[model samples]
Target: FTPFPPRQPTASARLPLTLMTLDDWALATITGADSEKYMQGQVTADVSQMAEDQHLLAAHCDAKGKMWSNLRLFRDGDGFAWIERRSVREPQLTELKKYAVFSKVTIAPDDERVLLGVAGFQARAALANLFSELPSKEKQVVKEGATTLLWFEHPAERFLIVTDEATANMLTDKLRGEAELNNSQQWLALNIEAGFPVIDAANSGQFIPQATNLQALGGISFKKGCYTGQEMVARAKFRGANKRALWLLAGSASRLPEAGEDLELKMGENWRRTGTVLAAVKLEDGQVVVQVVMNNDMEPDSIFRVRDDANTLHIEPLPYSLE
Candidate 1:
């Protein structure tokens, strides 16, 4: 992990931030159906491999094997808890429920819960202090007093804070007081550093899981028996036919690239559509960073100026090695 010193107080500022209470989750409880069996059949990871206090990342794909949403699944008592983008929660819940009809699983949004995102070094310390405990090395859930903390490292210099509503409010207040309030921009920068991708409504159901680098990021388990998109995903893995993968890019452009923007490479004859931009955000440092899926030949260090047809995009190095 990239360690840094605690944050210093700013003179005076309103941090550019986005804070929303995710109140749209539908509660889905697994009971009669073999919960693990149902999940293994639907998600890209080996659901049965998940142990108590352990977390697994997976994708829920459609019939054609396209990903609807990427998820972080963990054990919560007798059931499982999933953390995903709030926009897709309803559709994802409905899609999974259709299959649950044949099994004994029950899925619904839990209105009693809330989630928070905290970024930067001081935020980390603040989270530790608020909980009165640091997270363990193992990817298990930790509890301190009334607060239940599910801590995980994202693909950047960031950490996730998942807890109940009451505790979430308390931590938010504490963080606001302690941290520099860089807002979600700092959080997005940290996410890019962690090499994690967030799938939202704009890019939903557009790319396959592998194209989003889910498997490369520990989100898919091939050994796990048949799931919704296992065949296509497995074939691409074993046969080595997948041509596009996630790439990071940076530039000083004022406008941000929208998700689902077609990317192309000018060959001798044709401008082939090689990939598409999935996500983009402005960094606190004034650089624009984006997540893209492009042709395998797209070198991370290669300098290729983005076409002005949409927006000027310059590639940036991913914080971690894709290999």
Candidate 2:
């Protein structure tokens, strides 16, 4: 069993504000008539609805309506760039390039730069202290003399700061001195606490946006115009047809659960596979925090077991109201 970190100060004091270099991402500029139209048609969120100072979390799906890659789309000057998980960057880029053959978009990796990420309650304040000008609620890119800072909110209380390599290290050092430098599990705990969903290589093409509660999390836009996978996503929304949704689970075990692990729930007579675990992390208090997609009817008192053959799992109420 993996031992949990020692108990520390307040959750915020133990929180990690480290800036990790995200090389797993590649940048592509989408402009021109054909490219813009293709993007507007290919993503689940409405690209046209995105303003110059805003960002959209969208999914690129195959023709069958299954997601191919999940991305955070942001406007950069005259065009837009997609930020995706590093592991699938190459394949995702290739997949998009195949369709760009006939479009006007320029699809290629932006190797000239790097990406950094920061999370936690103090992330916004940390960034504010780092830069003279604090970032606004709307997304903003601060182009200093040499480096650029892409600041945006990940969810309600969670914030993200993406910058180039050199600036990222400097910020990381400063933040670490001000905050706690916990392990990656601590970061995952913060995300679980915030009810944010991250679709990566393992489950990328398996779930639609609604199944992961993207709609409830502000990742989906129904009022916006058409986009790829919108038909199925909208149908799931208006029709109330989705059977499963994201849930928060906790276990007192030291070992963390894997992202793709199965969640077993006893229905009537036998244990059934209801949902797959999305993400997990070890909290500072020696508790395992996880997010899973289970039956929509699974209540607060519902009982489930980890399919990993570990300890029993308990359902926890999300920090925020789903409504």
Candidate 3:
């Protein structure tokens, strides 16, 4: 097998201060006396270790270790809330509730809650005006009254605010006064640049955590007790069984590639189909950034193009390592 180009550490340039409604994201809740224990047995992360001051990137896998969804897990009032794409809420929550009858937890969607994204220059300062303190590091969280802010330190300094409609409206109204208000495309571009994998309805259950580079992002807990699909994940890790990983690619196309679209790699003078587009975003300058899952053994600098298209999507270096 040819050695694929290794990921080189790349720190993204700081983004300009901007706020987004993040309407594409949705919130789900797990509550009750046994919420913590029930959640620990369901996801890839150690849920017992979660606290109000921190959040987790966790994967909910099927019995075979294929991911149903991935979420940003955070503590809510006496319960837990997860932030995931709205497109995945049904599948991820339905499957997650499969074993709920045996426990004291109740799984439900909270459509009343809203998600907000803040990033770029002075993003922290803009948020500081509304809160007493801010989370200072990646995965760190700060809660005040009805609002919660979580910090992420990849692609750029950013925050995910979880709150109710009134609180969200209040914050956005004030924050907009201090920064630019963009749409979901900018946030999606940031995620692509950060190499974060998205599990949507189109590709749900199609990949293992390793295939999505979840292990590389600290989303998996190897030492945690068994959950659905722990065996496949562990086997892939210890036996070196996984051959695919998430990759970042950039090139313009006649139109932006949609999730689940196939990508073709150049083989001599012809192109062969390979990889699945997990997410894609078009930048202000017309450049499209795509996140894909494909074989990890290609020769460094191998060319990839969207299926049936001539645009070459050159692989961009991931900020994190795969090994």
Candidate 4:
């Protein structure tokens, strides 16, 4: 049985307002009368539920249920814009177009768009002037012209902004007037802490949604009709075939680890390789936060050595249960 439970929260003060440019992210547009219907059959989430005021996390998978990428989909104009990592943009975009021949859909990446992360209690207050209306609920989206804001409230209040370069530059400058400006690592660390998974080029199509705890985050819709990977995904859910789950890990490292890096577990004096780095962030000079998919049987306190590095990491708690 998969008994991976979350650790209880430790006392920590609220974080301050911060702004970070998510330059590693890319946006893809899907337009046409069949956009919704086409996406409903391609992604794991219920595409019909998407609206101008809502966004959802979903996975684009292959026939075998292996994920090509994770997506944050939101309504844009008369169509939709899905945010994914730049590392997997081309592959995802290409695959998404492969099956659109019969459908009245046009799929392509919008390289001009930018993704920005704004976090902390004052996030809404900071954007209050620019945004016509703020998204109050988690996953709720509010759009004003070409700019969109997606609210999140897991570890803290946060928002993701998607817009063009000129608008992004203006928003960045305006937001940083009251928020601390930081790099993308800070935004990625927040994603790790929230148990959100990112599929990069190095690890794309290497895992199912369950391995990254996507089900726990409401990414997969079992009730939805067939998608490319629906069969295997449903079978795994019912048959308990998935053995690995995403985990939050923390420790100090000499350098930041990349996705697809090996982690080693020490058995006495010898070390055996275990787990894969799905994403990592060097929070400080040496402190690192990582998201990994590994055997869920491992306990919270289990120590793991980073492969080929002197640094060791230990499991940290997620806010959700991976049962």
> Which candidate comes out best when scored by lDDT?
3
lDDT by residue (1-323, candidate 4, tens digit) is 01112221211124567777777788899998998889998899998876678887899999999999999998876678889888999999888888987888889889777788777657778878877788877438877777888888766778888877788777766765577676566667778878889788989999989999999998999999889999988877865588889998888776666899878887788888888889987653345778899997897668886776787888888889876
lDDT of 3: 0.82
Candidate 4 lDDT for residue 229: 95
Runs of candidate 3 with Cα error greater than 4 angstroms are: 1-14
| Candidate achieving higher lDDT, 2 or 4 | 4
lDDT of each: 0.62, 0.63, 0.82, 0.80
Better of 3 and 4 by lDDT: 3
Can you write out model 3's per-residue Cα lDDT over 1-323, one digit (the tens) per residue?
Answer: 11112221112363567777776778999889998888888899998877778887899999999888899998887789999888999989899998987788889999877788788888888888877878878438888777888999878888888877787777767875577776666677788899998877899989989988999888899998978899988987865599988999887676777888888899899889898999987666656789999998776698988777757788888888886
lDDT of 1 by residue, 36-88 (tens): 78887888987787776666568999877788888888766466778776667
Instruction: Mark the regions of model 4 whose C-alpha exceeds 4 Å error after superposition.
Output: 1-15
Give the residue spans of candidate 2 off by over 4 A.
1-35, 120-122, 138-158, 173-176, 182-186, 266-270, 308-310, 319-323
Candidate 2 positional error at 209, Å: 1.1
For residue 118, what is the lDDT in candidate 3? Answer: 83
Q: Write model 2 residue lDDT over 82-166, tens digit each, in one string.
A: 7775566777777777666667767666655555556555667777777776446654555554454565443334444445656
The TM-scores of all predictions, comma-separated, are 0.81, 0.81, 0.93, 0.91
What is the alpha-carbon lDDT for the whole of candidate 4?
0.80
TM-score order of candidates, top first: 3, 4, 2, 1
TM-score of 2: 0.81
Q: Point to the candidate with the largest TM-score.
A: 3
